[model samples]
Target: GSHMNTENKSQPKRLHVSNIPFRFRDPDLRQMFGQFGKILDVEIIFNERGSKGFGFVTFENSADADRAREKLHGTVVEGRKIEVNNATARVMTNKKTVNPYTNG
Candidate 1:
Protein backbone atom coordinates (compact mmCIF):
# COMPACT_ATOMS: atom_id res chain seq x y z
CA GLY A 1 0.00 0.00 0.00
CA SER A 2 2.88 2.29 -0.65
CA HIS A 3 2.55 4.96 -3.33
CA MET A 4 4.86 7.64 -4.67
CA ASN A 5 4.47 10.73 -2.55
CA THR A 6 5.69 14.32 -3.06
CA GLU A 7 8.23 14.33 -0.30
CA ASN A 8 11.63 15.07 -1.83
CA LYS A 9 13.91 16.61 0.72
CA SER A 10 17.67 16.46 0.63
CA GLN A 11 20.24 17.30 3.22
CA PRO A 12 23.43 16.15 4.86
CA LYS A 13 22.80 12.68 6.23
CA ARG A 14 26.19 12.47 7.87
CA LEU A 15 27.26 13.71 11.28
CA HIS A 16 30.58 15.06 12.56
CA VAL A 17 30.79 13.66 16.04
CA SER A 18 33.74 14.56 18.20
CA ASN A 19 34.96 14.78 21.81
CA ILE A 20 34.27 11.08 22.32
CA PRO A 21 36.17 9.23 24.98
CA PHE A 22 39.66 8.17 24.00
CA ARG A 23 38.82 4.71 25.26
CA PHE A 24 35.82 4.53 22.91
CA ARG A 25 36.61 2.60 19.77
CA ASP A 26 34.94 2.39 16.37
CA PRO A 27 32.84 -0.59 17.41
CA ASP A 28 31.66 1.33 20.41
CA LEU A 29 30.59 4.25 18.24
CA ARG A 30 28.57 1.95 16.04
CA GLN A 31 26.53 0.52 18.90
CA MET A 32 26.00 3.94 20.36
CA PHE A 33 24.89 5.56 17.11
CA GLY A 34 22.86 2.55 16.05
CA GLN A 35 20.30 3.51 18.69
CA PHE A 36 19.25 6.50 16.54
CA GLY A 37 18.42 4.92 13.20
CA LYS A 38 19.67 2.94 10.23
CA ILE A 39 23.27 3.76 9.53
CA LEU A 40 25.43 3.33 6.48
CA ASP A 41 28.60 3.16 8.52
CA VAL A 42 30.42 4.72 11.44
CA GLU A 43 33.88 6.22 10.88
CA ILE A 44 36.37 6.71 13.68
CA ILE A 45 39.25 9.16 12.97
CA PHE A 46 41.18 8.65 16.17
CA ASN A 47 44.66 8.54 14.67
CA GLU A 48 45.53 12.16 15.33
CA ARG A 49 48.64 11.97 17.45
CA GLY A 50 47.02 9.87 20.12
CA SER A 51 43.33 10.62 20.83
CA LYS A 52 41.56 12.50 18.09
CA GLY A 53 38.28 11.68 19.79
CA PHE A 54 36.42 12.44 16.62
CA GLY A 55 34.55 10.53 13.93
CA PHE A 56 31.85 10.69 11.29
CA VAL A 57 28.45 8.96 11.27
CA THR A 58 26.53 8.29 8.09
CA PHE A 59 22.81 7.52 8.28
CA GLU A 60 20.27 6.44 5.73
CA ASN A 61 18.65 9.87 5.87
CA SER A 62 19.28 13.33 7.18
CA ALA A 63 16.42 13.03 9.60
CA ASP A 64 18.09 10.20 11.42
CA ALA A 65 21.43 11.95 11.33
CA ASP A 66 20.05 15.23 12.61
CA ARG A 67 18.03 13.47 15.25
CA ALA A 68 21.07 11.60 16.43
CA ARG A 69 22.93 14.86 16.80
CA GLU A 70 20.41 16.17 19.28
CA LYS A 71 20.35 12.94 21.21
CA LEU A 72 24.08 12.33 21.36
CA HIS A 73 25.45 15.82 21.81
CA GLY A 74 26.31 16.84 25.34
CA THR A 75 25.91 13.24 26.43
CA VAL A 76 28.94 12.30 28.43
CA VAL A 77 30.48 8.86 28.18
CA GLU A 78 33.04 7.74 30.69
CA GLY A 79 33.29 11.24 32.10
CA ARG A 80 33.91 12.56 28.60
CA LYS A 81 31.31 14.76 26.90
CA ILE A 82 30.63 14.33 23.18
CA GLU A 83 29.75 16.73 20.37
CA VAL A 84 27.90 16.39 17.05
CA ASN A 85 27.34 18.37 13.86
CA ASN A 86 26.54 18.07 10.18
CA ALA A 87 29.41 16.18 8.55
CA THR A 88 28.20 16.66 5.00
CA ALA A 89 29.44 20.21 5.17
CA ARG A 90 32.02 22.13 7.10
CA VAL A 91 31.56 25.75 8.22
CA MET A 92 34.09 28.08 6.69
CA THR A 93 33.82 31.86 6.80
CA ASN A 94 36.13 33.06 4.06
CA LYS A 95 37.21 36.68 4.26
CA LYS A 96 36.61 39.08 1.43
CA THR A 97 39.19 41.51 0.01
CA VAL A 98 36.84 44.48 0.24
CA ASN A 99 36.76 46.89 3.13
CA PRO A 100 33.42 48.46 3.92
CA TYR A 101 35.01 51.67 5.13
CA THR A 102 37.68 52.16 2.51
CA ASN A 103 36.99 55.91 2.43
CA GLY A 104 37.53 56.28 6.18
Candidate 2:
Protein backbone atom coordinates (compact mmCIF):
# COMPACT_ATOMS: atom_id res chain seq x y z
CA GLY A 1 0.00 0.00 0.00
CA SER A 2 1.28 3.46 -0.89
CA HIS A 3 0.65 6.40 1.40
CA MET A 4 0.97 10.11 0.65
CA ASN A 5 1.80 12.70 3.27
CA THR A 6 -0.77 15.45 2.97
CA GLU A 7 0.66 17.88 5.45
CA ASN A 8 0.61 21.29 3.79
CA LYS A 9 3.28 23.06 5.77
CA SER A 10 4.78 26.23 4.33
CA GLN A 11 7.17 28.95 5.43
CA PRO A 12 5.56 31.88 7.17
CA LYS A 13 5.60 35.26 5.46
CA ARG A 14 5.57 37.15 8.75
CA LEU A 15 8.59 38.86 10.27
CA HIS A 16 9.34 39.91 13.82
CA VAL A 17 11.06 43.26 14.15
CA SER A 18 12.43 44.12 17.58
CA ASN A 19 14.36 46.85 19.35
CA ILE A 20 12.41 49.41 17.34
CA PRO A 21 12.63 53.00 18.46
CA PHE A 22 9.82 53.98 20.77
CA ARG A 23 8.86 56.68 18.30
CA PHE A 24 8.32 54.24 15.41
CA ARG A 25 4.74 53.20 14.77
CA ASP A 26 2.72 51.08 12.36
CA PRO A 27 2.93 53.66 9.56
CA ASP A 28 6.69 53.83 9.86
CA LEU A 29 6.98 50.06 9.74
CA ARG A 30 4.72 49.89 6.73
CA GLN A 31 6.80 52.49 4.97
CA MET A 32 10.03 50.65 5.69
CA PHE A 33 8.79 47.21 4.68
CA GLY A 34 6.78 48.46 1.76
CA GLN A 35 10.01 48.93 -0.16
CA PHE A 36 10.46 45.16 -0.27
CA GLY A 37 7.00 44.20 -1.50
CA LYS A 38 3.30 44.41 -0.86
CA ILE A 39 2.85 44.66 2.86
CA LEU A 40 0.02 42.58 4.14
CA ASP A 41 -0.05 44.14 7.56
CA VAL A 42 2.05 46.10 10.02
CA GLU A 43 1.48 45.89 13.73
CA ILE A 44 3.40 47.54 16.53
CA ILE A 45 2.83 45.85 19.85
CA PHE A 46 1.50 48.42 22.27
CA ASN A 47 0.01 48.66 25.71
CA GLU A 48 -2.53 51.12 26.97
CA ARG A 49 0.37 53.46 27.56
CA GLY A 50 2.48 53.27 24.37
CA SER A 51 4.58 51.23 21.92
CA LYS A 52 6.42 48.15 23.26
CA GLY A 53 9.63 48.52 21.20
CA PHE A 54 8.64 45.61 18.99
CA GLY A 55 6.49 45.00 15.98
CA PHE A 56 5.48 42.61 13.22
CA VAL A 57 5.33 43.02 9.46
CA THR A 58 3.58 40.56 7.23
CA PHE A 59 4.35 40.44 3.53
CA GLU A 60 2.38 38.98 0.70
CA ASN A 61 5.16 36.51 -0.02
CA SER A 62 7.76 34.70 2.05
CA ALA A 63 10.52 35.81 -0.32
CA ASP A 64 9.72 39.42 0.44
CA ALA A 65 9.78 38.70 4.13
CA ASP A 66 13.15 36.99 3.81
CA ARG A 67 14.56 39.88 1.86
CA ALA A 68 13.28 42.37 4.38
CA ARG A 69 14.78 40.33 7.21
CA GLU A 70 18.17 40.25 5.53
CA LYS A 71 18.19 43.94 4.67
CA LEU A 72 16.69 45.24 7.91
CA HIS A 73 18.43 43.12 10.53
CA GLY A 74 20.97 45.22 12.40
CA THR A 75 19.86 48.33 10.54
CA VAL A 76 19.94 51.32 12.86
CA VAL A 77 17.15 53.81 12.99
CA GLU A 78 16.63 56.74 15.27
CA GLY A 79 19.68 55.70 17.38
CA ARG A 80 18.46 52.12 17.87
CA LYS A 81 19.53 48.96 16.11
CA ILE A 82 16.64 46.84 14.90
CA GLU A 83 16.58 43.06 14.69
CA VAL A 84 14.50 41.17 12.19
CA ASN A 85 13.67 37.49 11.83
CA ASN A 86 11.02 35.07 10.82
CA ALA A 87 8.13 35.18 13.21
CA THR A 88 7.80 31.99 15.22
CA ALA A 89 4.33 30.56 15.48
CA ARG A 90 3.10 30.28 19.01
CA VAL A 91 2.66 26.73 20.26
CA MET A 92 0.20 25.69 22.93
CA THR A 93 1.19 23.24 25.65
CA ASN A 94 -1.04 20.56 27.14
CA LYS A 95 -0.04 21.06 30.75
CA LYS A 96 -3.07 20.80 32.97
CA THR A 97 -3.94 23.76 35.09
CA VAL A 98 -3.68 23.19 38.82
CA ASN A 99 -6.68 24.04 40.93
CA PRO A 100 -5.77 26.54 43.62
CA TYR A 101 -8.44 25.15 45.95
CA THR A 102 -7.48 21.46 45.55
CA ASN A 103 -4.07 19.89 46.25
CA GLY A 104 -2.68 17.50 43.65
Candidate 3:
Protein backbone atom coordinates (compact mmCIF):
# COMPACT_ATOMS: atom_id res chain seq x y z
CA GLY A 1 0.00 0.00 0.00
CA SER A 2 1.09 3.53 -0.70
CA HIS A 3 -0.14 7.05 -0.20
CA MET A 4 0.64 10.45 -1.57
CA ASN A 5 0.55 13.76 0.24
CA THR A 6 1.16 16.88 -1.74
CA GLU A 7 -0.42 20.13 -0.80
CA ASN A 8 0.70 23.69 -1.28
CA LYS A 9 -0.52 26.98 0.06
CA SER A 10 0.74 30.53 0.19
CA GLN A 11 -0.23 33.87 1.63
CA PRO A 12 -1.78 36.16 -0.96
CA LYS A 13 -0.02 39.09 -2.60
CA ARG A 14 -2.43 41.78 -1.55
CA LEU A 15 -1.61 44.67 0.75
CA HIS A 16 -4.00 46.78 2.77
CA VAL A 17 -2.98 50.39 2.69
CA SER A 18 -4.56 52.32 5.51
CA ASN A 19 -4.46 55.72 7.22
CA ILE A 20 -4.41 57.16 3.74
CA PRO A 21 -4.72 60.88 3.29
CA PHE A 22 -7.90 62.31 1.84
CA ARG A 23 -5.82 64.20 -0.66
CA PHE A 24 -4.44 60.99 -2.13
CA ARG A 25 -6.12 59.74 -5.26
CA ASP A 26 -6.15 56.48 -7.25
CA PRO A 27 -3.01 57.27 -9.20
CA ASP A 28 -1.14 58.31 -6.10
CA LEU A 29 -1.02 54.79 -4.66
CA ARG A 30 0.55 53.20 -7.76
CA GLN A 31 2.96 56.11 -8.03
CA MET A 32 4.09 55.61 -4.47
CA PHE A 33 4.18 51.83 -4.26
CA GLY A 34 5.17 51.42 -7.88
CA GLN A 35 8.62 52.58 -6.96
CA PHE A 36 9.09 49.33 -5.08
CA GLY A 37 7.61 46.98 -7.67
CA LYS A 38 5.10 46.40 -10.39
CA ILE A 39 1.56 46.51 -9.06
CA LEU A 40 -1.09 44.31 -10.64
CA ASP A 41 -3.95 46.50 -9.50
CA VAL A 42 -4.78 49.53 -7.34
CA GLU A 43 -8.13 50.06 -5.73
CA ILE A 44 -9.29 53.10 -3.74
CA ILE A 45 -12.90 53.61 -2.71
CA PHE A 46 -13.47 57.34 -2.46
CA ASN A 47 -16.22 59.79 -3.24
CA GLU A 48 -18.06 62.86 -1.99
CA ARG A 49 -19.58 60.76 0.89
CA GLY A 50 -19.41 57.50 2.84
CA SER A 51 -15.76 57.02 2.05
CA LYS A 52 -12.74 56.39 4.28
CA GLY A 53 -9.08 56.96 3.52
CA PHE A 54 -8.02 53.41 2.76
CA GLY A 55 -7.37 51.23 -0.25
CA PHE A 56 -5.99 47.91 -1.53
CA VAL A 57 -3.00 47.12 -3.66
CA THR A 58 -2.19 43.87 -5.43
CA PHE A 59 1.36 43.27 -6.51
CA GLU A 60 2.73 41.18 -9.31
CA ASN A 61 4.35 38.95 -6.67
CA SER A 62 4.43 38.48 -2.93
CA ALA A 63 8.04 39.57 -2.86
CA ASP A 64 7.06 42.91 -4.36
CA ALA A 65 4.33 43.34 -1.82
CA ASP A 66 6.75 42.67 1.03
CA ARG A 67 9.17 45.22 -0.30
CA ALA A 68 6.50 47.86 -0.41
CA ARG A 69 5.27 46.89 3.02
CA GLU A 70 8.73 47.17 4.51
CA LYS A 71 9.26 50.68 3.18
CA LEU A 72 5.76 52.17 3.20
CA HIS A 73 4.36 50.68 6.37
CA GLY A 74 4.53 53.13 9.28
CA THR A 75 5.87 55.79 6.94
CA VAL A 76 4.46 59.28 6.79
CA VAL A 77 3.36 60.68 3.48
CA GLU A 78 1.70 63.97 2.58
CA GLY A 79 1.29 64.86 6.27
CA ARG A 80 -0.52 61.59 6.96
CA LYS A 81 0.56 58.27 8.42
CA ILE A 82 0.57 55.34 6.01
CA GLU A 83 0.10 51.76 7.11
CA VAL A 84 0.60 48.65 4.99
CA ASN A 85 -0.41 45.15 5.97
CA ASN A 86 -1.09 41.84 4.24
CA ALA A 87 -4.70 41.16 3.31
CA THR A 88 -6.35 37.76 3.62
CA ALA A 89 -8.35 37.45 0.45
CA ARG A 90 -8.65 35.30 -2.61
CA VAL A 91 -8.00 36.68 -6.05
CA MET A 92 -11.70 36.41 -6.76
CA THR A 93 -13.56 38.53 -4.21
CA ASN A 94 -16.89 37.07 -5.39
CA LYS A 95 -16.30 34.17 -3.01
CA LYS A 96 -16.81 36.58 -0.09
CA THR A 97 -20.27 36.88 1.34
CA VAL A 98 -22.08 37.91 4.52
CA ASN A 99 -25.00 35.53 4.30
CA PRO A 100 -26.13 33.96 7.54
CA TYR A 101 -26.26 30.48 6.08
CA THR A 102 -26.37 28.48 2.87
CA ASN A 103 -27.94 25.22 1.74
CA GLY A 104 -25.91 22.32 0.51
Best model per lDDT: 2
RMSD, every candidate, angstroms: 11.3, 8.1, 7.6
- TM-scores for all candidates? 0.66, 0.72, 0.68
The lDDT for every candidate, in the order shown, is 0.75, 0.80, 0.77
By TM-score, how accurate is candidate 1? 0.66
In model 3, what is the error at residue 21, expressed in angstroms?
1.2
Clashes of each: 0, 0, 0
Error of 3 at 30 (Å): 0.4
Steric clash pairs (candidate 1)? none
lDDT-better candidate, 1 vs 3: 3
Q: Provide the lowest-lDDT 10-residue window in model 1.
A: 3-12
- The pairs that clash in candidate 2 are none
- Give the alpha carbon lDDT tens digit for every residue of 13-102 in model 1: 778888887677667787888787887777666456645778887788877877888999898888878898887544473555578686
* Worst 10-residue lDDT window, candidate 3: 2-11
lDDT of 3 by residue, 1-104 (tens): 43432234443467889988776776878888888888778777656652378888888888778999999998888777888988755455465565666643
- For model 1, the superposed segments whose C-alpha errors exceed 4 Å read 1-12, 46-51, 88-104
